[PDB]
């Protein structure tokens, strides 16, 4: 009865994991792209600095 | 002085004149071009030879005809200062914008007033508690320091130093002065009818209290030297009347961002972000004329826009350079309805030690970093698998680092209103009990829900009788 | 009264001037001015305006010789006439700055009367060649364990110290400063270690508090205080830690030993930004001057153990250099990261935690090595290393949870312990002879078998157990600074003793 | 000819602009000497602007200087003195013994400019170095005057690998080496200095089988990127000239790349991808092609780079990358694992590596070791959370053998016989190949892990775990 319902809970339990994972990727994918859009700002900036001089 | 001049361009708020006779005012000189909106005030800045200088404008210029008349007012601008500036609004210029007709002066001083020296300094060591419990707990303020907020503006950050206000300066008594770089007009309006409404202006007797205000309207040449202003009317309490003052200042990134702004139109090759060379030099030599002196003791509250609250932006970043301590509030802990909103983590002052404040206090705060912080670091874990997969041992920690969070917020009689919930200032020496009996997990064992916005220990207690019902 | 020999000295100073360059300015703004003139103008210049300003001398263009002003502006005003000094930046070095604030041009600000100076120097030296070096060999403690321990210091030597904004940042250095008060006070020549503690960009409340937190230790008379505050002109910021460097080659050639504390070069940066912006030379990489490298690294190797030809000498260095958001791939931190000689990386997550001093050790190196580590010292904590590296792996796995194995946890027990050992009071450095014994009992797992909670107070015990009974090991701890096969034996007898209390 | 006189114009940096005389024009990549209170400070030509404004490098510090003042031109690039008799002794950038041995007896000067040998020229044969060190030998074989190159981390040892490759295979070596130091610490240098003399690679009164070309950090920006053109010239010499073979160094480039970033900047020109210069490709090309095994000679160079905060995508790191034949990563996790050598065995790949040329047995013996190590750092993670007891009993003892292999291959530097005092030790490759092999056949699955720390050969692992077990 206890190895079931180990084994069971388990699947239960690493199934919620999934999803809170799967919420995770999706709000650090969010940090992602803006800190790569910045990323790319930032380096534009400096270039057009150089240039204006 | 006398010295005609044709104004040769009009670049912004960033008016060139040039002088035809050969005596030209020198830098930092004003000059004041008199039109049908009466005398605009423009500050010399640089020298571009062949007797065209390059002035800061400090009043709008639309409108302005090119070879218009200027005529030099000579030497820095002189403001009026006395304790007749209590009960006053003053502008940028001097002018009464309170309405209470010329300020009755004594002496005028020069805006630009060189900091006082190294051997003028007097270092404070002087308790001041606030009755704010995360204030009091996590970095003790001191008379005459220089205290720090940072993030989102009047989002709370006005709101906590109106709070500030209510406690520290009413208790302080004595002169106080209150200054406004480019804050939102209505909020002014409120901190004017309040201030009368507390009486700390009254305008019938004496007010222990003076204003200056700068709008954020004001041009942004304007809001520059509204702060070199405020000093001023800061010295002649600190020097010439030798009282212990006050100082607010709201917001000193205004200070940076204004001189920004100018900085591009001035013709400054720009850098890191966009700011200004001279932003160093600048922000130094302006919280260098802040300062507790042995002529006098000024506590100073500074509250910082840190802009997409990104505290590694260069003008935040060298904001925190010159402050004695800091509180910097967090968005994060704003969306947790943590009010007030200051990081428990991201707070400092020197005035926290062993020594200051013993070391009862400080044993006591530094069980209260130590769980914060393996709570946050137990975020990612709890986050990815549930609390119960935490270790039992860590999870006497989580829990009382829940409460001690919803603990830290302390209902503000400020923000009674927007709390709805009655404000309570609560002692230096009920706050370290408070914490020191939660940290024994005395009262753990009520919900977390009970430590939630609501004051001292004694409050939770009953808080807990009012929930069991 | 002082006022009638004063002006007798001023009547005193008379005598015509036969201004063999002029030149008259022009174009003068934002505290950068540019004269017209100065046909004959050495570079690097110190150059009077007339109007009792004094600014050195940057750029020598075919129009417009750009003399960066070290005063304000408000002083100065178009068309004026410069006076070219004829010499070079100096400034007075001699012993008499023990015990002396000054500023950038040598004036005392702390007003402790007029500077007792055997020379004058110029703020740009030549650093000690290879041929007069030679290799460290002397240790230099800085009464903090873990720095002891894990990054030893070593004269001649740079090591850097990096970490996130004012984390106590100053302190971690005063800690050194502190500590060297007991070779200081001691007469033995050859451990005296002149210190210099140089404050750039810092406000002069700042300072001040620190001079007076080093009176209150009353270690200003071995310390000179180099300052440069908020307010001084981002010229004379600039200029400061090469006339730092100055003041400290004097010791540093009379042979004594010596160390100067540059805080915080991240404030020279900004200061040569501003300064290479107005004279509007090209702007570098992240706008910090692409000649920043040369700059900061011209003025760190001139700390060196010279040889003993030349009488080894040795000035020590330890810059620091503050992390903006901890980023460690900013240009101004990667440079400086080359240019030393170690990394003593502070880390802000671990002050939270309460070690305190906070060490990232493994993002702490000392590539000069424990050369300079105390032979005792060395013996003793030969498997903290490792300890302490085990501690670090298992304590990653230990963040998941899993039920872990007797040896991990023989690890985990032990490295826990080990930390707790660490951990020190700010303001309160330990002195070696008595730290020798702590890391025997923690490395010899003594201590690993003490619980947690008590290894705060079985420190304190254990020091006055070994006061009381040990005193005679720890004065031979001192004296013969090798761990010898009696001592190791006493020791460890001592500490098995002390293990129920 | 008539030494054309200039007056500088303008002292902005190590840029110094001279005003040569009207109608006598100097030349792109000159060298010019002004005559100063010390030495001669020279002046690399290396614009022309017109009216006869030339736009030139510093060589050496320009304080002091006065606008205006006689300029000698001297010519041609800075030419170097070349010799046997250059052997023996410290030379600095500008061409002087710095290690005060007298003036260097020149035999011949050359020009720090020199062209790349045509393709015609250049022909390369394939042949494996030895280097002694387990790791290197195994998992990434250096070959005989190819252009190795030292990828790593700041001083994590790394002058240390460097010394332990001159340790073994330059006092091994028949042919001469160079070592040139580029922006490298006094400290170091001293080391460096001390040393070789104790290594008795230089003799003072004796012979010396090394010649050194120290240039420090402390020197202007300029004078910082022309150390590699002038070490590069004495190698041209012996390698041409003297006709031997060499064994180049340099160290470290990435100071190369930094310096010609300054100074590019400083030319004026707009700052390029990460600041670094527009030139940077051709420039590293220059020094890179310049260095090859011609019919005339071999040169073996191992050239240090320092990988900017330990991220290869970095441009410099990254235009070198391809640059260099033989590439070896140290790698910080491996250092902090208490592993050293500090190479990553996974990220170390050469060109000669392939089965025909370091021959099947070595090639099929190292293939094991890659896929093994490959296993366990994917098995790495799943360790990490799931556990050990979730993987398969052939994982499992896989996982064993990796981390005995991981172990296995730590070696003793002869070089940390100062650094961790324990004996060097140099392993045949015949030798290491066979030793490897017996490890991945199990044979010695009887060992526990520590009885394969800085050990040798399979005497050693054997020797060790019997020590061990006591």
Redesign the interface.
């Given at each position: 009865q206890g190895y079931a319902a180990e084994i069971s809970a388990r699947r239960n339990?690493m199934d919620?994991?999934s999803k809170?994972?799967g919420d995770?990727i999706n709000r650090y994918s969010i940090l992602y792209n803006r800190t790569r859009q910045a990323v790319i700002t930032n380096?534009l900036?400096?270039?057009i600095?150089?240039?204006?001089? | 002085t006398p010295i005609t001049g044709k104004v040769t361009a009009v670049i912004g708020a960033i008016v060139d004149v040039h002088f035809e006779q050969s005596e030209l005012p020198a830098i930092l000189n004003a000059l004041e071009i008199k039109t049908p909106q009466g005398k605009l005030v423009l500050e010399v800045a640089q020298h571009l030879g062949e007797n065209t200088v390059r002035t800061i404008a400090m009043d709008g210029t639309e409108g302005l005809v090119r070879g218009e008349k200027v005529l030099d007012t000579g030497g820095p601008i002189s403001v009026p200062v006395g304790r007749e500036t209590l009960g006053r609004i003053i502008n940028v210029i001097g002018e009464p914008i309170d309405e209470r007709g010329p300020i009755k002066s004594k002496l005028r001083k020069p805006i630009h007033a060189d900091p006082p020296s190294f051997a003028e300094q007097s270092t404070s060591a002087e308790i001041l508690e606030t009755g704010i419990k995360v204030v009091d707990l996590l970095a003790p303020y001191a008379r005459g320091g220089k205290i720090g907020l940072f993030g989102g503006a009047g989002v709370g950050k006005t709101v906590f130093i109106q709070e500030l206000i209510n406690n520290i300066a009413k208790a302080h008594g004595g002169f106080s002065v209150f200054t406004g770089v480019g804050e939102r007009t209505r909020e002014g309006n409120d901190l004017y009818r309040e201030m009368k409404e507390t009486g700390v202006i009254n305008l019938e007797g004496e007010s222990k209290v003076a204003l200056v205000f700068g709008q954020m309207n004001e041009p942004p040449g304007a809001r520059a030297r509204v702060a070199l202003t405020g000093l001023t009317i800061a010295e002649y309490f600190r020097d010439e009347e030798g009282q212990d003052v006050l100082l607010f200042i709201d917001n000193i990134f205004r200070f940076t961002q204004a001189g920004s702004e100018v900085s591009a139109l001035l013709g400054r090759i720009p850098s890191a972000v966009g700011y200004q060379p001279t932003l160093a030099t600048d922000m130094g030599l302006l919280q260098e004329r802040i300062t507790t002196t042995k002529k006098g003791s000024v506590t100073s509250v500074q509250a910082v826009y840190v802009p997409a609250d990104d505290l590694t932006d260069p003008a935040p970043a060298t904001t925190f350079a010159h402050l004695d301590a800091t509180t910097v509030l967090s968005r994060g802990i704003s969306e947790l309805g943590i009010y007030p909103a200051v990081d428990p983590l991201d707070s400092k002052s020197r005035l926290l030690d062993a020594a200051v404040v013993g070391q009862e206090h400080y044993d006591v705060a530094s069980k209260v970093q130590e769980t914060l912080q393996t709570y946050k670091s137990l975020q990612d874990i709890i986050a990815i698998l549930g609390m119960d997969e935490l270790s039992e041992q860590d999870k006497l920690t989580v829990e009382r680092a829940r409460k001690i969070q919803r603990f830290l917020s302390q209902p503000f009689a400020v923000a009674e209103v927007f709390t709805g919930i009655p404000g309570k200032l609560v002692r230096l020496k009920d706050t370290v009990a408070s914490f020191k009996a939660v940290l024994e997990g005395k009262y753990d064992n009520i919900p977390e829900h009970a430590f939630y916005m609501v004051g001292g220990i004694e409050d939770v207690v009953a808080k807990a009788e009012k929930l069991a019902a | 009264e002082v006022s009638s020999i004063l002006e007798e000295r001023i009547k005193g100073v008379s005598d015509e001037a036969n201004l063999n360059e002029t030149g008259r300015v022009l174009a003068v703004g934002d505290g950068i001015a540019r004269v017209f003139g100065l046909n004959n103008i050495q570079a690097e210049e110190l150059v009077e305006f007339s109007s009792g300003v004094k600014g050195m001398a940057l750029n020598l263009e075919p129009g417009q010789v750009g003399i960066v002003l070290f005063g304000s502006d408000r002083l100065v005003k178009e068309g004026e006439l410069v006076k070219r000094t004829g010499n070079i930046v100096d400034v007075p070095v001699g012993p008499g700055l023990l015990g002396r604030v000054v500023d950038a041009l040598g004036n005392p600000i702390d007003g402790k009367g007029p500077i007792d100076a055997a020379g004058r120097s110029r703020a740009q030296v030549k650093a000690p060649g290879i041929l007069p070096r030679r290799s460290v060999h002397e240790p230099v403690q800085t009464g903090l364990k873990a720095v002891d321990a894990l990054v030893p210091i070593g004269r001649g030597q740079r090591e850097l110290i990096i970490g996130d904004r004012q984390t106590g940042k100053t302190a971690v250095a005063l800690d050194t400063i502190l500590n060297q008060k007991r070779w200081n006070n001691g007469s033995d020549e050859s451990k005296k270690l002149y210190c210099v503690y140089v404050a750039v960009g810092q406000k002069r409340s700042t300072v001040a508090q620190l001079v007076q937190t080093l009176e209150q230790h009353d270690a200003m008379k071995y310390s000179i205080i180099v300052a440069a505050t908020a307010s001084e002109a981002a010229p004379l910021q600039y200029l400061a830690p090469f006339t730092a460097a100055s003041i400290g080659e004097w010791f540093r050639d009379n042979g004594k030993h010596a160390l100067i504390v540059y805080d915080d070069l991240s404030k020279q940066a900004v200061a040569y930004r501003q300064l290479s912006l107005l004279l509007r030379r090209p702007p570098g990489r992240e706008a910090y001057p692409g000649d920043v490298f040369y700059l900061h690294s011209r003025l760190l190797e001139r700390a060196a153990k010279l040889s003993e030809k030349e009488g080894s000498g040795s000035l020590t260095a330890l810059p620091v250099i503050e992390t903006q958001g901890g980023d460690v791939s900013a240009y101004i931190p990667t440079n400086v990261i080359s240019i030393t000689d170690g990394q003593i990386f502070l880390e802000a997550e671990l002050f939270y935690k309460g070690i305190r001093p906070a060490i990232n050790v493994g993002l702490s190196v000392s590539r000069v090595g424990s050369a300079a580590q105390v032979k005792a010292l060395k013996q003793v904590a030969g498997s903290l290393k490792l300890f302490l590296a085990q501690y670090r792996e298992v304590a990653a796995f230990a963040q998941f949870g899993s039920d872990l194995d007797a040896s991990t946890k023989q690890t985990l027990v032990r490295g826990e312990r080990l930390t707790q050992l660490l951990k020190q009071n700010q303001y309160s450095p330990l002195a070696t002879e008595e730290q020798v014994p702590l890391i025997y009992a923690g490395v010899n797992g003594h201590l690993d078998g003490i619980e947690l909670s008590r290894i705060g107070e079985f420190e304190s015990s254990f020091l006055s157990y070994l006061k009381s009974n040990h005193n005679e090991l720890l004065t031979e701890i001192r004296e013969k600074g090798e761990l010898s096969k009696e001592l190791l034996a006493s020791l460890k007898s001592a500490t098995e003793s002390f293990v129920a209390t």
């Open positions: 339990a919620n994991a809170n994972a995770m380096e900036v400096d270039i600095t150089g240039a204006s001089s | - | -």
